[PDB]
Amino acid sequence: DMYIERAGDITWEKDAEVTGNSPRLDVALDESGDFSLVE
Amino acid sequence: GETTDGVYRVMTRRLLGSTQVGVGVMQEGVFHTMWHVTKGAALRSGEGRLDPYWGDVKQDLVSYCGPWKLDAAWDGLSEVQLLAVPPGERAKNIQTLPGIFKTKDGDIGAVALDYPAGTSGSPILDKCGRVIGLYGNGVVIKNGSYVSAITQGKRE
Numbered sequence: 001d002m003y004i005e006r007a008g009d010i011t012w013e014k015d016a017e018v019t020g021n022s023p024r025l026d027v028a029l030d031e032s033g034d035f036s037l038v039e
Numbered sequence: 040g041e042t043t044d045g046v047y048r049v050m051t052r053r054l055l056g057s058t059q060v061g062v063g064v065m066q067e068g069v070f071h072t073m074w075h076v077t078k079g080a081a082l083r084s085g086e087g088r089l090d091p092y093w094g095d096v097k098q099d100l101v102s103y104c105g106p107w108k109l110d111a112a113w114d115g116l117s118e119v120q121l122l123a124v125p126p127g128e129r130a131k132n133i134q135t136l137p138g139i140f141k142t143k144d145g146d147i148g149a150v151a152l153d154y155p156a157g158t159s160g161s162p163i164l165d166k167c168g169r170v171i172g173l174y175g176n177g178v179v180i181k182n183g184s185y186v187s188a189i190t191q192g193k194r195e
């Protein structure tokens with residue numbers, strides 16, 4: 001049996017930690033909802 | 040139960056200890072998460088029970104108590120925040136510029152941020168604070184790093 005606990009409000013936080021790159025990827029999506037790399 | 044808008048951990052006791060299998064978003068009294076997190080299973084909130092209302096394994100989405108409510112979209116330009124909610128750790132905003140998933144059916148936003156699996160269902164935000172989709176379905180790239188789609192459902 002799964003259960004939920006509240007973890008915070010949904011808000012934009014000014015001066016949040018800004019990281020991560022921005023890559024363009026070619027992908028397929030199967031019937032099972034699993035994405036895969038099309039190279 | 041607690042039906043307050045905001046972001047929630049999804050926990051099980053079926054393993055060792057309490058374990059965070061994923062994350063979700065309560066809005067308009069509907070709970071939104073990813074299908075692989077709950078597998079369609081019912082949820083408990085205090086003594087409250089949440090029953091699944093809509094899901095699609097292919098979109099990897101599921102709503103509880105009502106139809107999918109979150110209709111906001113990435114505009115294609117602006118940065119966004121992953122409101123990440125990792126196992127055993129405090130909700131943390133991470134601002135990022137999404138990349139792109141190019142598919143035979145069209146282009147979706149992608150977010151390159153690597154967090155434990157139990158973070159699946161953490162929401163992604165536009166600057167006005169609206170949820171434009173959920174982090175936690177996507178792909179592992181050359182490097183070994185993980186890239187997630189911005190997965191959004193359709194509102195009726």
Ligand SMILES: COc1cc(COc2cncnc2)nc(N2CCNCC2)n1
Pocket residue numbers: 034075153154155156159175176177178185186187
């Ligand atoms: C596409 O996003 C993910 C990530 C993960 C967990 O892998 C991670 C590895 N390293 C860091 N963080 C996470 N599982 C799933 N799924 C969903 C669909 N199959 C069932 C598990 N999706």
